[PDB]
Design a protein around this ligand. Structure first.
Ligand SMILES: [Ca+2]
Ligand SMILES: [Mg+2]
Ligand SMILES: [Mg+2]
Ligand SMILES: [Zn+2]
Length: 403
């Protein structure tokens, strides 16, 4: 396989999501959808009266539904959050300014997202492709929480005042904005709740936001496959433009990211409406891109298999990462998965490698790691594989309590 493309769509479910899903379905391709449930409540400032229909269609035709937070952090964009906030925030266009403030509350709007989904679609948890509890992406932020050793944050993703193009904008990578620092704590809170978060390698976006109908300038299918080619094995999350889209500290050649390209785009770019002739002009771009990427040797997959799901009969090499019932695991030795050797919290074949920082069972801890346990932070003094008898509060020799 030339490579595996993960085509992902943010900010639905809206009416245009239906057209996008139909094109994906026609071309035999599954997408990952990072949804904001406030479109179900009718307050997202889009064409969204068919949002519930769109949510159902994504579930019924096998796409992966993931968590993009209830209201896309726009409660942080305006004074008081209400039915008109999406409209108000679209009028100033200040989505990235003070986007993250109280990280505990901001992180909890990902939990609110799931409560709303389950109120509108009570059986949503009977769908195997519903990953609202396991997969998230932060609004505006090319930040990653994949494994204990695969993480990245965009340190310029949001600002305390100026936008990246406004004169006087500065991004000090080792003194980032308060909004960025808050978004980092949000990533960490979500990982401690079991989430993986995925950023993106390339953004399928209007290449001229200036003109009256910016959607029309969405990169042509052929040119965009050129960008996907360039993103392959080139650590594109750190080289992407503009500056607020970079992921900093990305572990460039890490094996879990090899031969993979995560594409970010938005259904609202494939709609005929306020942003231009998106449907009649960009929907054909999407269909053609799907066909020519397949023709070139690419394969399309969904973010739930980005970290391959463990399966009986598969072969693993020492160091391969899998995901098993939502938990990330690293292989201790080369082997062929047999049904009794599933990863677990006491398996000697697999260790837990969740990107979480709370003390966890069966983690291969290194000296210098820091874990959180019963509200306290502990430094790991001595490398060890954690186990239930070795909790930090008692193992005064393996761990040292901090602050
Ligand atoms: Ca959870
Ligand atoms: Mg941010
Ligand atoms: Mg998980
Ligand atoms: Zn978004």
């Amino acid at each position: 396989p030339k490579g595996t493309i993960y085509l992902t769509f943010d900010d639905g479910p809206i009416n245009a999501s239906i057209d996008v899903i139909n094109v994906l379905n026609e071309q035999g391709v599954k997408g990952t959808f990072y949804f904001n449930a406030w479109h179900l409540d009718g307050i997202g400032d889009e064409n969204e009266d068919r949002a519930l229909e769109a949510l159902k269609l994504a579930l019924d035709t096998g796409h992966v539904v993931a968590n993009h937070s209830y209201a896309h952090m726009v409660h942080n964009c305006v004074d008081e959050f209400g039915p008109t906030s999406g409209a108000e925030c679209n009028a100033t266009g200040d989505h990235q300014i003070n986007a993250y403030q109280d990280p505990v509350y901001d992180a909890s709007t990902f939990a609110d997202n799931l409560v709303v989904f389950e109120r509108y679609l009570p059986n949503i948890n009977s769908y195997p492709n519903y990953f609202g509890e396991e997969l998230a992406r932060l609004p505006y932020t090319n930040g990653w929480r994949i494994t204990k050793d695969f993480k990245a944050d965009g340190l310029c993703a949001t600002s305390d005042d100026l936008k990246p193009w406004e004169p006087g904008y500065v991004c000090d990578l080792d003194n980032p904005s308060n909004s960025v620092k808050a978004s980092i704590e949000v990533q960490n809170i979500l990982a401690n709740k079991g989430y993986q978060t995925h950023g993106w390698d390339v953004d399928w976006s209007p290449e001229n936001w200036g003109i009256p109908m910016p959607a029309n300038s969405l990169t042509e299918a052929e040119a965009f496959l050129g960008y996907v080619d360039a993103a392959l094995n080139s650590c594109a999350p750190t080289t992407i433009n503009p500056i607020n889209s970079k992921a900093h500290g990305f572990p460039c050649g890490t094996p879990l990211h090899a031969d993979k390209v995560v594409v970010l785009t938005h259904e609202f770019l494939y709609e005929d409406g306020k942003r231009g002739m998106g449907a009649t002009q960009n929907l054909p771009k999407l269909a053609k891109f799907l066909r020519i990427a397949k023709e070139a040797g690419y394969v399309f997959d969904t973010i739930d298999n980005y970290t391959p799901v463990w399966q009986v009969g598969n072969a693993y090499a020492a160091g391969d990462y899998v995901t098993h019932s939502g938990t990330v695991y690293k292989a201790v030795t080369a082997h062929i998965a047999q049904q009794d050797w599933a990863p677990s919290s006491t398996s000697s074949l697999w260790t837990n490698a969740d990107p979480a920082t709370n003390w966890t069972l069966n983690v291969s801890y290194e000296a210098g790691d820091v874990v959180t346990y019963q509200g306290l932070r502990y430094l790991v003094n001595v490398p060890h594989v954690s186990q239930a008898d070795w909790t930090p509060n008692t193992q005064n020799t393996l761990f040292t309590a901090l602050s």
